[PDB]
């Protein structure tokens, strides 16, 4: 995840990861976090 | 890696065999066992010869429990402590063992150092007297005490050691100064500022400090005489003053009041001390506003 | 004065001992001893549900073919007999819990008496130190005389 | 008891096959603070708050290590020998460099001794609650946060135990010298 | 005022619960915990005596680790969800131990504690034991509410 | 899989690696001051600053260098980095809590490779010494894996054996290699077991070593020229195990012949004639006396 | 904590020169093993002693 | 019930600031308890440096003084009766406020 | 003086007796008594593994031929009923272990009080021997008078 | 006089303690302990 | 007579009261360990082996018990005669 820049993200630091087209064409949330000044390494299991 | 892993576990097994082989010599060479005939414990007598030729007849010299030359004396535990712990830090470090304590490597492992009791505070003073004698490069411990008698800057340092030998014997001969009343014509010879030094620990150099005339002009000259290279912006901090004079927060607040690191000052014991900084000059000028209530207090 | 100060320092050691025992009743050990006796007797409804289930299962015949039958006819009387023998052990376990809980209560009530015997002795020796302080003042006035 | 406290935390590190390790906490979900209770304020539970924030499991293990060092040094005190009081001083100094120095609290604060209706004013409270929501997503009459009193008694016990060691007293303060 | 009679009438109780958010480690007991398993209760009783050497605490740990193995090796057979829809409510599972004539456990997961792609650990309860003579045929067993 | 972290040794070096992570990218060059001590004249506590200087113009596009620092003090203060050798001061009025910087007003980094005095004029003073210029860029040609499997060392670098190079980062760099070729012919089989010593290592651009991590893959060889272990039960009552040339007794016939020694009493059981009760030989063989 | 001997001790407390040099090194190791005094040699901490 | 959950989150977020800013914890190096140092900045700017001012137990400015219990008593109990009542708190006792 | 020396030699015999009993707590006998109560209650997992193995073996039919069947249908309910009756004896054995371990603890705490009563009496009689030595010196000065 | 008044107030505390224990014999707990031992042995005719 | 006579230990030994760095010198230790391996298959700062203290208390108890027997005392040392 890239660090927080106000010009390309906005005034709020929240960010969410969604999964889509896995069992239906709708979306489902797999992560929710807050942007910082440092990268965030996220390792997730993606079902198929 | 596994080449090292094989040689190191072979080195542990050879180290355990050296402990067992040296044990079997020293067990069966015991005169406690040789007097008891019924045990039938065989002396070695063939590998005991090779042990005594190599180690100068070590297995024939046994000692009583409580001596210094034993394998289980506290001098034998101090040897294994000093052998292992001397390499915990690097040789160029300030936390090196022979750097902080040069007297440990030179101490004799004698019977007199193990039995004879002496004061820990006497051991601590002669360690401090030796370190001061080498840095100032003085002659003996008397020149150390003469140097401390006139040394100005530090917080408890104007210590005239011959003076405390004088004033304490007077506190031991007549406790409470009984002869201050019974002999007025000898007490009249002494000025009352000198008789203050009998009750209160006021050195003859501390009398020179308390009676200086502090004016504008010589205040910069009397500062370097009484404090040295301390910068006055760093001396005036309350956290520095607490550690310098060995005070507490309740004991310091009687002098400089209530202070904090957020730029605020409060009245403590109806007085204020503010280091008001001067704009466009950069100088610091200290005020002392002191309050007394009239017509009611609360 | 040294005689009564060693008596005061000895009665203080009993007031501090029995007072510590009175203030600190049932400890971490003796709480677990009465919890186990409360848990060993809470199995009445669970054993009875296993005896009534084992009795009705054995009333069904188990041998089929050219020779039928095989059910144990005395299964209900065996099950009710086992529950009433087990409930006699439950009532003895419940009685051992309460008798241990009341042995510990009477132990605390004796600690309160031994606490108050040391408190009354501290107040007695403090009054003997006061009269000895008056006996010394009558000996200094005799020294003045 | 030292062997089982060092299955959670060893301040001297861990040695696995002749080499010191990169961790002092043997429990890796204390090494990474993983919350395993996100509803800690449903009931009054001192553990469920510590499950939401596992740093209190660090402070609890820290306090049990201190209770080990103090009670062992109290055991080594009451032998009243020469080398046991010197042993008891070692277990007291070992508990002092785990605590570090005593915290220097600032003595002058932003506390103006307010009136009771100024401190219990609801517009002070509603400005306080709306400011936390602005941080999560004038008020100077607030109450200042407080250091732990039970933690403070560790510095005050060890300052008293060493004072009795240095001045030839008992653990209760009674003198060991003959009057 | 709902909490008036407990934790707001007195000062000593108000400072108890309000410090429990900030410093709960003053109230954490290593031997007692709200929500501990029955194995931790059986572990404390195995070490509740006085003479407690290194051999006893290792035999009690391996007796603890034996009962830990039975719960970690459970086989989830079936389940039942106590709602119409899968999004809300709570689902009850059923387990199987690795013993012959096995023993069945059960626990819950709360779907209202599902947040951001993962259940919170408060959703899960502990495995509760079923003391019942159960012998289903080819894992034909269902919980139901 | 080779993994590189940029953090280390929580006292005095973790706070300097957090400054490179927060205020810099991986290809930057820094000055790490490896000798930090308090000034005994101007300090009233034992806290200190942890300075790192960042250069001007690198992977992080920066017009002008700046001196990073980290303070453990919570009170608001200025931070002044006085340089006695260059007569220049880097001062940050109203420093933030923890990580903050003071920009370098004229780009001369060679005035910073000497003694720096950092203070806040409210209690903290630090003798900043021992500058070390580092280059934190990493090329994959210097990231190698050393495999010493028996005879000859085999070195596999990351420029040829990685399909996808990861993004540069101070936190994690996962170097997943391909299926590497190890010549297992020539292993030293001592006690039917060998080993393959795999050593991870990596180098930076200025030649400094980034640490190492040694593994070991145990290889066990099955011999086929030996016989299986065989349990025997001879008709004299002796049971033994046939490990290829040796016979090791399993049971004892002591309790069979103890019964005749136990009819009289314990004085007859615990004598030496009971301790001389013999046991039969292990199968076919004989007794020989070698002088 | 540096000179490994007590200066705030009273003058009525007595040791020997061996038993104080033992307590100096015992105080020295307990600071060196637990990372109180920095740059301790890790190859010596992992010794059998 | 959404207002109760936001009220519990305000108690936990303010706690996590004031726990990890403790000088009792900052002297103990071996705990490795990380100071916030990024949301501690926003807390001290909003509340005039509240998380840097800690107090000793037994003072009046604490969060757990008896003056802090009297403030929560007077805040809640002053609205138990109506303002025009004879049993109003500031009517019977004008010296409390 | 002979009166107080026989009182000193009697209080020394109590300080040496109760001090020997306090320093030497649980002996070689009472260690084996609490080891057996720890070994009599560590058989819960072993008896349960034999009841579950005997239950499933009896669910297999044992009569074959022209008349099949023979399995005991209430075998699992018999086995779980025997484990819960045996676990009530285990919890009583565990409770007898802790109650014996805490009876011995309170016995040592009373030995400490009786040790300190004799130590305070030794320091009291030593102060009575000192005042009697002063009463003799006042009688020699009267002899001189 | 103060010495004997503290001795009187101490012997009064024993006369009030042991007198309260003598007047209040078997309590609500120890009644239930002997009721259970009377109920555990009244099952002879029912088991038979 | 099962113990035999009390062991006469030699009172003068090869013990020169060495410095602490002379006794804890590693080349003294490595010459000690390499000499045992030469025997299994200058150093005079070594520590001398020691008789058993618990065994020594048997000669000291029995010398005290017989002394109380020969001089009309109790087992604790108290006199059996009338002063």
């Amino acid at each position: 995840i890239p660090p927080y820049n106000l010009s390309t993200h906005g005034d709020e630091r929240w960010f969410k990861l969604y999964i889509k087209h896995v069992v239906d064409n709708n979306s489902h949330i797999i992560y929710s976090g807050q942007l910082t000044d440092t990268n965030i390494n996220i390792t997730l299991f993606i079902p198929l | 890696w596994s080449e090292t892993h094989d040689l190191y576990h072979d080195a542990q097994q050879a180290q355990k065999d050296n402990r067992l082989y040296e044990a079997r010599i020293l067990k069966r060479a015991n005169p406690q066992l040789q007097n008891a005939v019924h045990l039938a414990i065989l002396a070695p007598n063939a590998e005991l010869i090779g042990y005594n030729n190599q180690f100068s007849g070590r297995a024939s010299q046994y000692v009583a429990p409580g001596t210094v030359s034993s394998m289980f004396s506290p001098a034998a535990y101090l040897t294994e402590l000093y052998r292992e712990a001397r390499n915990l830090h690097a040789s160029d470090s300030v936390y090196y063992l022979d750097t902080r304590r040069p007297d440990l490597k030179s101490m004799a492992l004698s019977q007199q150092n193990m039995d004879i009791e002496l004061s820990t505070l006497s051991l601590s003073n002669e360690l401090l007297l030796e370190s001061i004698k080498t840095e100032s490069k003085l002659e003996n411990y008397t020149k150390v005490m003469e140097m401390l008698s006139t040394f100005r800057p530090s917080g408890a340092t104007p210590y005239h050691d011959a003076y405390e030998n004088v004033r304490e014997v007077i506190q031991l001969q007549d406790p409470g100064l009984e002869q201050l009343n019974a002999s007025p014509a000898i007490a009249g010879l002494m000025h009352q500022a000198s008789l203050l030094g009998i009750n209160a620990s006021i050195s003859p150099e501390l009398f020179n400090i308390l009676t200086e005339e502090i004016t504008e002009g010589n205040a910069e000259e009397l500062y370097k005489k009484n404090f040295g290279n301390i910068e006055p912006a760093s001396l005036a901090m309350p956290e520095y003053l607490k550690r310098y004079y060995n005070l507490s927060d309740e004991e310091l607040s009687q002098f400089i009041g209530k202070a904090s690191n957020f730029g605020q000052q409060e009245y403590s014991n109806n007085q204020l001390i503010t280091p008001v900084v001067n704009s466009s000059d950069g100088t610091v000028k200290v005020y002392r506003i002191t309050r007394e209530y009239t017509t009611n207090a609360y | 004065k040294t005689v009564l100060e060693k008596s005061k320092a000895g009665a203080q050691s009993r007031f501090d001992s029995y007072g510590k025992l009175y203030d600190e009743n049932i400890n971490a050990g003796e709480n677990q001893a009465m919890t186990l006796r409360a848990s060993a007797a809470g199995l009445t409804t669970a054993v009875q549900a296993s005896r009534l289930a084992g009795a009705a299962a054995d009333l069904v015949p188990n041998i089929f073919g050219f020779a039928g039958g095989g059910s144990r006819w005395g299964a209900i009387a065996e099950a009710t007999g086992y529950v009433m023998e087990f409930s006699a052990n439950v009532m003895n376990t419940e009685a051992d819990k309460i008798s241990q809980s009341e042995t510990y209560r009477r132990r605390r009530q004796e600690w309160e008496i031994q606490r108050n015997n040391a408190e009354a002795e501290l107040k007695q020796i403090d009054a003997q130190l006061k009269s000895l302080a008056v006996r010394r003042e009558a000996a200094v006035l005799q020294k003045t005389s | 008891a030292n062997r089982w406290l060092k299955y959670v935390w060893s301040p001297s590190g861990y040695i696995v096959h002749g080499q010191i390790q990169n961790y002092q906490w043997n429990v890796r979900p204390l090494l990474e603070d993983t919350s395993w209770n996100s509803d800690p304020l449903d009931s009054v539970d001192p553990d469920a708050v510590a499950q939401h924030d596992p740093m209190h499991y660090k402070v609890s293990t820290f306090m049990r290590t201190l209770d080990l060092l103090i009670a062992r040094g109290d055991h080594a005190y009451r032998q009243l020998e020469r080398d046991t009081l010197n042993e008891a001083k070692m277990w007291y100094m070992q508990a002092l460099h785990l605590l570090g120095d005593k915290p220097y609290l600032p003595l002058s604060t932003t506390w103006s001794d307010p009136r009771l209706d100024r401190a219990a004013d609801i517009t002070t409270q509603n400005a306080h609650d709306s400011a936390i929501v602005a941080l999560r997503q004038t008020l100077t009459d607030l109450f200042l946060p407080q250091i732990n009193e039970v933690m403070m008694n560790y510095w005050q016990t060890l300052a008293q135990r060493v004072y009795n060691l240095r001045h030839n007293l008992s653990i209760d303060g009674q003198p060991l010298y003959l009057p | 005022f709902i909490d008036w009679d407990k934790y707001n009438k007195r000062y000593s109780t108000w400072a108890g619960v309000s410090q429990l958010v900030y410093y709960p480690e003053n109230y954490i007991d290593p031997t007692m915990r709200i929500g501990q398993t029955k194995m931790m209760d059986a572990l404390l009783q195995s070490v509740s005596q006085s003479q407690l050497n290194a051999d006893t605490v290792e035999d009690a740990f391996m007796s603890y680790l034996t009962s830990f193995e039975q719960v970690a090796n459970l086989k989830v057979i079936s389940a039942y969800h106590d709602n119409i829809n899968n999004d809300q409510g709570l689902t009850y599972f059923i387990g199987l131990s690795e013993t012959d004539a096995g023993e069945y456990y059960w626990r819950s997961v709360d779907h209202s504690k599902f947040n951001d792609g993962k259940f919170a650990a408060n959703a899960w309860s502990e495995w509760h034991k079923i003391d019942c003579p159960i012998n289903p045929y080819k894992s034909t067993i269902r919980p139901v509410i | 899989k080779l993994r590189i972290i940029h953090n280390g040794y929580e006292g005095q070096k973790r706070n300097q690696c957090n400054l490179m992570n927060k205020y810099g990218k991986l290809g930057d060059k820094f000055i790490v001051y490896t000798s930090l001590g308090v000034n005994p004249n101007n300090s009233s506590n034992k806290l200190m600053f942890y300075p790192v200087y960042q250069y001007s113009g690198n992977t992080s596009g920066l017009n002008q260098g700046r001196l990073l620092f980290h303070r453990d003090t919570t009170y608001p203060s200025k931070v002044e980095a006085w340089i006695p050798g260059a007569k220049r001061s880097l001062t940050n009025q109203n420093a933030a809590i923890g990580d903050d910087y003071a920009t370098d007003s004229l780009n001369k980094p060679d005035d910073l490779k000497q003694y720096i005095f950092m203070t806040d004029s409210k209690g903290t003073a630090t003798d900043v010494s021992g500058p070390v210029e580092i280059n934190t860029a990493i090329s994959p040609a210097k990231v190698q894996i050393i495999v010493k499997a028996g005879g000859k060392e085999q070195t596999f670098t990351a420029d040829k054996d990685v399909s996808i190079q990861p993004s540069p980062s101070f936190d994690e760099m996962n170097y997943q290699f391909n299926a590497l070729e190890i010549d297992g012919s020539g292993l030293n089989f001592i006690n039917n077991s060998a080993s393959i010593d795999v050593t991870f290592t990596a180098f930076a651009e200025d030649g400094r070593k980034l640490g190492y991590e040694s593994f070991s893959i145990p290889v066990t060889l099955k011999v086929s020229t030996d016989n299986a272990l065989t349990l025997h039960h001879n008709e004299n009552g002796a049971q033994y195990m046939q490990w290829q040339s040796y016979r090791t007794r399993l049971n004892t016939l002591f309790a069979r012949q103890l019964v005749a020694r136990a009819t009289t009493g314990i004085d007859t059981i615990l004598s030496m004639e009971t301790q001389n009760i013999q046991e039969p030989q292990l199968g076919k063989g004989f007794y020989a006396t070698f002088v | 904590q540096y000179l490994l001997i007590d200066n705030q001790v009273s003058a009525a407390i007595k040791t020997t020169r061996i038993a104080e040099a033992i307590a100096s090194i015992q105080l020295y190791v307990n600071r060196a093993l637990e990372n109180v005094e920095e740059n301790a040699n890790s190859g010596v901490i992992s010794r059998q002693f």
Side-chain angles (χ1 to χ4, degrees), chain B residues 1-2 229 231 234 237 239-240 243 261-262, chain F residues 41-44 75-76 121-123 195 197:
Chain B
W1 179 75
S2 179
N229 56 3
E231 294 180 354
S234 65
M237 297 184 290
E239 182 66 27
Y240 185 80
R243 190 177 298 277
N261 290 319
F262 288 165
Chain F
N41 291 319
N42 290 320
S43 65
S44 65
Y75 61 90
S121 296
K122 291 178 71 67
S195 65
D197 293 331

Side-chain angles (χ1 to χ4, degrees), chain B residues 102-161:
Chain B
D103 57 350
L104 292 177
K105 64 181 181 180
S106 65
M107 185 181 69
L109 296 175
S110 65
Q111 187 69 38
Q112 292 83 17
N113 291 321
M114 188 181 72
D115 290 332
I116 296 171
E117 292 180 353
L118 75 163
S119 179
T120 303
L121 189 62
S122 296
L123 291 172
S124 178
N125 289 321
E126 67 182 2
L127 183 62
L128 290 172
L129 287 172
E130 183 67 28
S131 297
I132 296 168
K133 185 175 70 67
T134 60
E135 293 292 328
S136 296
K137 293 182 180 180
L138 294 174
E139 184 177 1
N140 55 2
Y141 291 164
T142 303
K143 298 293 183 181
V144 175
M145 294 297 174
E146 185 178 1
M147 183 272 294
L148 294 175
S149 65
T150 61
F151 187 73
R152 296 289 183 90
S154 174
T157 190
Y159 180 75
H160 197 283
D161 184 74

Side-chain angles (χ1 to χ4, degrees), chain F residues 211-228:
Chain F
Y212 64 95
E213 184 179 3
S214 296
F215 290 165
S216 179
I217 300 170
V219 177
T220 301
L221 181 62
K222 177 171 182 179
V223 298
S224 297
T225 61
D226 56 350
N227 292 319

Side-chain angles (χ1 to χ4, degrees), chain A residues 9-37:
Chain A
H9 294 94
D11 57 350
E12 293 179 353
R13 294 181 180 177
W14 63 270
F15 70 102
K16 293 180 182 293
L17 294 177
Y18 293 167
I19 194 169
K20 192 180 179 181
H21 297 286
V22 52
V23 295
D24 55 349
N25 295 321
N26 297 115
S27 296
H28 297 284
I29 180 169
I30 59 174
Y31 185 79
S32 178
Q34 296 294 322
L35 290 170
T36 59
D37 294 331

Side-chain angles (χ1 to χ4, degrees), chain B residues 1-15:
Chain B
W1 179 75
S2 179
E3 184 178 1
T4 305
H5 186 274
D6 194 6
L7 295 174
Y8 182 73
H9 291 85
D10 291 331
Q12 289 182 353
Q13 185 61 254
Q15 191 271 332

Side-chain angles (χ1 to χ4, degrees), chain F residues 37-194:
Chain F
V38 297
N39 192 5
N41 291 319
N42 290 320
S43 65
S44 65
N45 54 3
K46 292 186 287 184
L47 296 175
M48 64 183 72
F49 294 99
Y50 298 103
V52 174
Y53 180 70
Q54 184 178 3
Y55 286 171
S56 176
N58 282 317
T59 297
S60 68
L62 188 62
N63 298 115
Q64 186 178 2
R66 60 183 180 179
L67 181 63
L68 289 317
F69 62 94
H70 182 272
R71 63 181 179 90
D72 293 330
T73 62
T74 61
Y75 61 90
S77 65
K78 61 98 178 178
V79 172
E80 181 178 1
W82 182 258
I83 304 168
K87 295 180 177 65
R88 190 180 67 189
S89 178
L90 297 178
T91 304
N92 191 3
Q93 297 293 323
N94 205 165
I97 298 171
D99 293 329
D100 200 356
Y101 62 95
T103 184
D104 186 69
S105 296
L106 55 91
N107 289 319
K108 293 183 182 179
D110 291 331
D111 293 331
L112 292 162
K113 293 181 181 179
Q114 60 183 356
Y115 180 76
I116 299 172
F117 180 73
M118 294 181 70
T119 185
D120 56 351
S121 296
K122 291 178 71 67
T124 304
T126 302
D127 294 331
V128 175
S129 296
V132 173
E133 180 179 0
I134 62 170
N135 191 2
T136 60
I138 295 167
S139 65
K142 292 181 180 180
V143 178
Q144 63 186 359
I145 289 176
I146 295 172
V147 177
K148 186 183 289 184
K152 183 66 177 177
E153 178 180 359
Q154 294 180 357
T155 301
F156 294 99
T157 61
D159 57 351
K160 295 181 181 180
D161 292 329
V162 179
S163 297
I164 298 170
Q165 297 292 326
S167 65
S169 178
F170 291 100
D171 194 3
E172 292 182 354
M173 286 178 287
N174 291 318
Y175 291 158
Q176 181 69 46
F177 285 11
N178 293 319
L180 296 178
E181 182 70 27
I182 299 171
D183 185 75
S185 65
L187 292 174
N188 204 164
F189 292 100
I190 300 299
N191 290 320
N192 291 319
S193 297

Side-chain angles (χ1 to χ4, degrees), chain D residues 9 17 40 53 109 134:
Chain D
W9 181 61
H17 187 71
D53 195 358
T109 58

